[PDB]
């Protein structure tokens, strides 16, 4: 019965085209198993200066293995990567690390952009018991009251790491729809390997996007989907003003070494508990402390540092696309317009405008690293006007 | 104890030789082919920039400017990069050009180097006989097999072939080398101790060393010539020549060439002539350093998981011979997976001494594309096993000496301490029992000193 039936599963899958060329097409189906969802982007409108809120379910669902030795191990490790790749892409923003554990919510790291503080917090978050049940109501309470004091010229989005369990919290979180719909705060959850309808209704009543974790690769995809600053609901803001352009200071300008250290509890700046020698300078406090392209606590305006953060999204929107042809128009001497090679896996990648020939390793290098076709350069800037 | 300099010696090859001979004899080592030989068998990055000025520096720059080229960071590394470059005798310390010593290079090398930098259609560049591809009569991967099998008939006939070696007088030098030897009846081409070490080595630079020692056995030809010719081999391959090695001939240049097809690295046709052939072998001599190109054959991955030697790939018999010295006694079939012994392969280094890196080298040379997707730490603990195994049998450090006991005084013993420490002929002392371990070679100078007082 089943001793045969356990091996009726194996026997055919083992078997293939016999005689010659055996265990060959089994490898071909594995390549045919590949090539999942690429981009499907092309959007406009919103996404600028997010104010994210990490919300972590700490529950007994973590004790199931399912991808890793812990579901936090699946979670927490790639959050650091998600932190770094965020600060890579979006430095104009800041993130609220808030942890739910034992039916409450602990705002673990404040809404800020200092990566080491966030990452070591995750390195502190390693040895978490995740005792108790999730409570989103305490999480939204922090999320309200913090972002309540943020301007309406702020992007208001929440990223919830939920372990798909029972949403164990009172006090009419169904009525928190109209609370937060009016409060123009977006809330995005993704479910860990299952679905919560109420939370699925929550996000579809939000405009925040809900998903379910499939796999570790798939876990990365939706992170990567939420790296990009999304086009949230209309009528948020237009502008955001008193973007402080700073100065770097060399502390060697006119008076050479007239100050042994530029942090002595009286100097304009010197914000954090450490010694400094003068590296930076804000306009409004005239605040000189450790360099930070974010904001301050006395002038209270945004320490904008343009080549970093006014450059990051500044080309992250205006992209175009390529096309693929299997044909052989042999442009070059059977070459690439970029790296100049050939393999011909029938993916001759042609630009939409300048129409230049590329490979996967030239398409990926654009569509992950270069983000534009340089074949448009020499082609845009020469007749540009 | 045991010799350990006969394995590597890869900067002293151009130093201990060169500094062991005269400046005018190494003035001969500034043939224009010998220019690339200088820069590469030394590997400092720090002296490798101190050269770079001198093509634009005819002038002797002052010593302090480059003595203070690099500040507080790595002053020793600057100093370690300095006197060795000076120990090449390529520099001249000027006296007082402007008021103080300002160093400068030998210009005749600067003459020779700049032709190998820009311009020059000279004798090595062109105009006399250098090189010549006329029409393809013979191909390189076919000759790569020659460049494999001559190594075999070298390395197998070291161990001993059921086949035979070609008619060489080289064995009478390799028996002379102390790699091989032969007792007088019939002259058996065995191994003494050192070919066994070279069996554990895999680079042609030892061959090169005995080929540098080839003229040393009372032969009087161009040592200047052959080391130029040692470079003149190091030209990759792809050249037959309209007998261009005879148009650029010399006496030893043709005769010792008969030996380079004995050494296999040249390939000579009918009458040992009409062409010449450098083999793809002509780039790993150039370093002696491991090299990703130095892969010979690409068998596969290995591992030594559960320290049980763990690999397959039915290879040629030379690798089988490379482990016939290294793994018998539970050999198996068609995959070459002789099991492990922590005693026998340990006993299989007793005729070599420690093969510490030579394990690690043949770790990355057993099956060659192993570093493609494997761990950086290829032996997890297994190096230390091999180490402790090597650190087991080495129970002795052989050292002769003369010892001075029952000395008549105690403070004059400290004089003879300070006397021998002046001489540097002491190895060890015991002051508590009035003892000094003194070299017996430097015994006589204290033996003379004690008899004088």
């Amino acid at each position: 019965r089943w001793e045969g039936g356990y091996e009726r599963t194996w026997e055919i899958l083992k078997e293939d085209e016999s005689g010659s060329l055996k265990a060959t097409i089994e490898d071909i189906l594995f390549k045919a198993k590949r090539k999942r969802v690429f981009e499907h982007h092309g959007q406009v409108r919103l996404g600028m200066m997010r104010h994210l809120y990490v919300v972590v379910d700490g529950s007994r669902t973590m004790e199931d293995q399912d991808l890793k030795p812990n579901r936090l191990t699946c979670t927490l490790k790639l959050l650091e990567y998600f932190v770094e790749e965020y600060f890579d892409q979006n430095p104009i923003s800041q993130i609220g690390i808030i942890v739910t554990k034992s039916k409450r919510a602990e705002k673990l790291t404040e809404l800020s952009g200092n990566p080491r503080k966030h990452i070591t917090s995750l390195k502190k978050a390693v040895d978490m018991t995740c005792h108790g049940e999730p409570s989103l109501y305490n999480s939204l309470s922090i999320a309200m009251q913090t972002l309540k004091h943020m301007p309406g010229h702020t992007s208001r989005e929440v990223l919830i790491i939920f372990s798909s369990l029972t949403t164990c919290d009172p006090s009419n979180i169904y009525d928190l729809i109209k609370t937060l719909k009016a409060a123009k705060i977006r809330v995005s959850v993704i479910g860990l390997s299952a679905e919560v309808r109420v939370c699925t209704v929550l996000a579809r009543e939000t405009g925040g996007t809900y998903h379910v974790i499939l796999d570790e690769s798939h876990y990365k995809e939706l992170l990567t989907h939420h790296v990009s600053p999304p086009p949230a609901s209309s009528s948020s803001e237009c502008s955001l003003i008193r973007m402080g352009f700073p100065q770097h200071t060399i502390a060697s300008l006119s008076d050479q070494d007239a100050k042994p250290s530029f942090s002595m509890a009286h100097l304009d700046g010197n914000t954090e508990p450490g010694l400094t020698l003068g590296g930076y300078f804000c306009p409004q406090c005239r605040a000189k402390y450790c360099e930070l392209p974010v904001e301050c606590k006395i002038c209270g305006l945004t320490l904008v540092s343009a080549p970093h953060l006014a450059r990051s999204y500044h080309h992250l929107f205006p992209l175009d696309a390529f096309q693929e042809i299997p044909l052989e128009e042999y442009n070059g001497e059977r070459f690439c317009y970029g790296c100049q090679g050939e393999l011909k896996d029938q993916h001759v990648y042609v630009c939409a405008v300048c129409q230049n020939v590329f490979c996967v390793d030239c398409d990926v290098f654009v569509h992950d690293s270069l983000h534009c076709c340089p074949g448009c350069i020499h082609k845009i800037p020469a007749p540009s006007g | 104890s045991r010799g350990l300099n006969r394995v590597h010696l890869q900067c002293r090859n151009l130093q201990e030789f060169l500094g062991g001979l005269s400046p005018g004899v190494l003035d001969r080592l500034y043939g224009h082919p010998a220019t690339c030989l200088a820069v590469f068998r030394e590997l400092p990055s720090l002296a490798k920039n101190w050269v770079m000025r001198m093509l634009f520096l005819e002038q002797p720059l002052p010593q302090a400017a480059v003595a203070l080229w690099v500040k507080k960071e790595f002053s020793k590394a600057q100093e370690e990069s300095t006197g060795l470059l000076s120990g090449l005798r390529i520099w001249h310390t000027q006296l007082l050009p402007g008021g103080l010593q300002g160093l400068i290079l030998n210009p005749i090398f600067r003459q020779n180097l700049r032709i190998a930098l820009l311009g020059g259609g000279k004798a090595w560049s062109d105009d006399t006989s250098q090189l010549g591809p006329d029409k393809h009569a013979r191909d390189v991967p076919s000759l790569d097999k020659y460049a494999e099998e001559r190594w075999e008939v070298v390395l197998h006939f070291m161990v001993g072939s059921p086949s035979a070696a070609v008619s060489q007088d080289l064995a009478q030098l390799l028996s002379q080398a102390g790699l091989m030897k032969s007792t007088e009846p019939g002259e058996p081409p065995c191994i003494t101790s050192a070919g066994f070490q070279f069996l554990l080595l895999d680079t042609p630079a030892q061959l090169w060393y005995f080929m540098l020692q080839y003229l040393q056995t009372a032969q009087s030809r161009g040592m200047d010539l052959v080391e130029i010719l040692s470079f003149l081999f190091q030209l990759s391959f792809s050249t037959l020549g309209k007998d261009y090695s005879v148009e650029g001939m010399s006496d030893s240049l043709l005769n010792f060439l008969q030996h380079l097809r004995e050494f296999g690295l040249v390939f000579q046709r009918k009458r040992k002539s009409r062409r010449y052939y450098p083999t793809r072998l002509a780039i790993n001599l150039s370093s002696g350093v491991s090299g990703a190109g130095g892969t010979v054959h690409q068998p596969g991955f290995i591992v030594v998981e559960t320290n049980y030697r763990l690999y397959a790939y039915t290879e040629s018999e030379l690798q089988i011979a490379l482990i016939a010295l290294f793994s018998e006694m539970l050999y198996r079939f068609p995959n070459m997976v002789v099991a492990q012994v922590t005693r026998e392969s340990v006993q299989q280094a007793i005729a070599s001494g420690i093969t510490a890196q030579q394990i690690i080298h043949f770790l990355r040379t057993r099956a060659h594309p192993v570093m493609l997707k494997q761990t950086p730490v290829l032996p997890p603990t297994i190096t230390d096993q091999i180490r402790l195994w090597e650190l087991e049998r080495d129970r002795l450090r052989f050292t002769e000496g003369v010892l001075y006991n029952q000395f008549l005084s105690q403070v004059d013993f400290e004089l003879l301490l300070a006397h021998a420490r002046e001489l540097g002929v002491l190895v060890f002392e015991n002051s508590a029992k009035r003892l000094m371990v003194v070299t017996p070679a430097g015994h006589s100078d204290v033996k003379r000193f004690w008899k004088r007082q």
Partner: protein, 652 residues
């Protein structure tokens, strides 16, 4: 006599196994393992079929081909070493009579289809179908119905031989009762089942059933219908884990009649699945404990995960005599007696309540412990119809003459270390054969004296103690359980004198030994304990996290390796994927201990675990080392000079 199924085949046809010349059937493989790997995949790789000995596993680019067959190809293999993503060797044995949902030619096809026509030597061929699949159902009419098979072409030899040896032959309250008898269908196809020859002839028959070329599979139809009584089973909230959930699923993938023998690793759910088989099966069962040591244990988790206890408890060794009158579910011990009135009425009860046991179940822990002389009394005394072999050992006692499927039938399941130690509750041991540089004033004497006081010399070593003193405080800092196993008492006694710890010996009072277990296994203040030869064997299963050993002299590799395999449990709830169970051994250099450890670490890498030899400490004088002066060691030395041979012998 009459105990001969097909023994393991390869004995000849091979000369200097370096078949650089012949490899003739491997040349058939080496054609297509080498002609096939050209374009970035191998489509080859015959598992390196070797005629004699065994063959291998590729398992380095398994992808789907051999990674599916990382398990499935291993049916008749056993995968005796384990590795990293590389090759993996095995052995070969009786394990086709277990693999009886498949034909020996069907595997032979896929044995070829894996090997890319890497052709057999034939050695396996002449050993493929030596025993055709054949079962022995025990159907409702009180003994057996003479089941043959799904397939017919076997009675054609059989019925032309066997009968000429020995013949064979209210409404709604009862409506569903025949609906159950409606479910008594064709036994998957045709059954071909005959009638019991009077219940006393099968013993006379079984010896001739195998006599041609067939082999028989005794079953246990004890679940749907059963004419005698059923005890009260009750599984009181005994949540268990998928290592052993798969196990009974292998015992029951078919209907309600098939016996079973399953291998676990050490310390696994041993007293669970049999207790699970005690209750789910609805039988009246039997345990055969190894000693009374086992007997107290196996009832205790039975007292835990079964509420079947209302003097419903039958433990039967060393004057236990607990519930003779009325047997429901029993624990016994292997009556190895054969003596002249050994236990007069007591073993008579063991005889006569075996008869009341009828068949029950043969719960058999670790039958590598059982000799073949006792394997006589396995079948001779106990004549049951379903067995249970709880034996971690696959191959034992170097006896390739008598195999074990003739004893217990098929050997059903073995559980992977990898899917317990990396994915599962079983902790990761760091094995440590630690050798030390001794003081030479133990060794000049040693080589002077060719008399067993020399054994005690390296034994009583402060260089051993400096290691012993070390890891105590080094693992006091992690606040986790540690246990040290010495060789003999009076050396170990001074360890319990110098750095005095919990400890035992041979004649120690058990009620205070139990207090020591209470002081150890409950009290968190002292995580340190000493044991002797007896405590591993005759009193306790210790439950700890870190083990140190001193004794390594006798060649019982596994017997020592199953001590550590039982004791070492999970250290903490560690988030990391590291090794958390810990083994330590103390090795004398230049010694029998140096020599034995070489074979011992050979046996360690024979099964293959996380192993490291360290020699130096993590800073020796970091700790205030006692015996730092060798004069103090000379004080110990003169005790050793005053010592006799009596401190230098174990329990045997």
């Amino acid at each position: 006599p009459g105990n001969d199924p097909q023994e393991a085949v390869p004995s000849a046809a091979g000369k200097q196994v370096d078949e650089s010349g012949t490899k003739v059937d491997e040349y058939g493989a080496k054609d297509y393992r080498l002609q096939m790997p050209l374009k970035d995949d191998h489509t080859s790789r015959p598992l390196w079929v070797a005629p004699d000995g065994h063959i291998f596993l590729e398992a380095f680019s398994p992808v789907y081909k051999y990674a599916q067959d990382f398990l499935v190809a291993i049916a008749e293999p056993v995968c005796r070493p384990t590795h990293v993503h590389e090759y993996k060797l095995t052995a070969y044995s009786l394990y086709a009579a277990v693999s009886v949902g498949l034909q020996t030619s069907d595997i032979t096809e896929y044995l070829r289809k894996l090997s890319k026509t890497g052709v057999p030597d034939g050695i396996m061929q002449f050993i493929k179908l030596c025993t055709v699949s054949y079962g022995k159902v025990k159907l409702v009419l009180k003994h057996n119905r003479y089941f043959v098979e799904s397939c017919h072409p076997d009675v054609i030899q059989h019925l032309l031989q066997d009968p000429v040896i020995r013949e064979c032959r209210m409404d709604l309250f009862d409506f569903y009762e025949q609906m159950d008898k409606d479910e008594e269908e064709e036994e998957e196809t045709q059954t071909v089942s005959f009638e019991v020859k009077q219940e006393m002839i099968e013993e006379l028959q079984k010896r001739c059933i195998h006599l041609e070329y067939p082999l028989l599979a005794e079953y246990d139809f004890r679940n749907d219908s059963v004419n005698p009584d059923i005890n009260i089973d009750l599984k009181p909230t005994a949540v268990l884990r998928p290592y052993q959930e798969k196990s009974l699923r292998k015992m029951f993938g078919n209907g309600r009649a098939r016996s079973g023998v399953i291998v676990l690793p050490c310390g696994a759910g041993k007293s669970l699945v049999g207790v699970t088989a005690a209750c789910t099966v609805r039988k009246r069962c039997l345990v055969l404990g190894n000693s009374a040591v086992s007997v107290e244990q196996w009832k205790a988790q039975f007292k835990m995960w079964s509420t079947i206890d209302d003097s419903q408890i039958c433990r039967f060794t060393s004057d236990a005599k607990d519930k003779p009158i009325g047997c429901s579910v029993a624990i016994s011990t292997y009556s190895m007696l054969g003596h002249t009135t050994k236990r007069s009425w007591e073993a008579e009860r063991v005889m006569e309540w075996l008869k009341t046991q009828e068949w029950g179940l043969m719960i058999l822990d670790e039958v590598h412990t059982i000799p073949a002389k006792m394997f006589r009394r396995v079948l001779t005394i106990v004549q049951a119809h379903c067995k249970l072999g709880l034996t971690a050992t696959l191959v034992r006692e170097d006896d390739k003459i008598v195999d074990l499927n003739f004893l217990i039938g098929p050997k059903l399941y073995e559980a992977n270390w990898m899917e317990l130690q990396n994915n599962g509750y079983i902790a990761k041991v760091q094995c440590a054969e630690v050798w030390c540089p001794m003081s030479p004033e133990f060794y000049r004497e040693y080589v002077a004296i060719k008399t067993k006081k020399r054994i005690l010399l390296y034994t009583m070593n402060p260089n051993k103690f400096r290691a012993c003193q070390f890891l105590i405080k080094f693992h006091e800092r992690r606040n986790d359980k540690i246990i040290v196993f010495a060789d003999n008492v009076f050396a170990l006694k001074e360890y319990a004198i110098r750095l005095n710890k919990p400890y035992i010996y041979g004649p120690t009072s058990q009620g205070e030994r139990m207090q020591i277990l209470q002081n150890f296994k409950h009290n968190p203040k002292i995580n340190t304990i000493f044991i002797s030869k007896v405590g591993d064997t005759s009193f306790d299963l210790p439950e700890a996290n870190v083990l140190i050993q001193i004794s390594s002299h006798g060649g019982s590799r596994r017997q020592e390796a199953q001590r550590l395999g039982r004791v070492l449990r999970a250290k903490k709830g560690m988030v990391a994927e590291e090794y958390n169970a810990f083994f330590y051994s103390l090795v004398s250099q230049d010694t029998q201990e140096m020599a034995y450890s070489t074979k011992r670490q050979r046996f360690l890498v024979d099964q293959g675990y996380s192993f490291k030899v360290i020699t130096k400490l993590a800073g020796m004088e970091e700790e205030d080392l006692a015996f730092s002066t060798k004069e103090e060691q000379q004080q110990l030395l003169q005790k050793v000079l005053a010592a006799t041979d009596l401190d230098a012998e174990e329990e045997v």
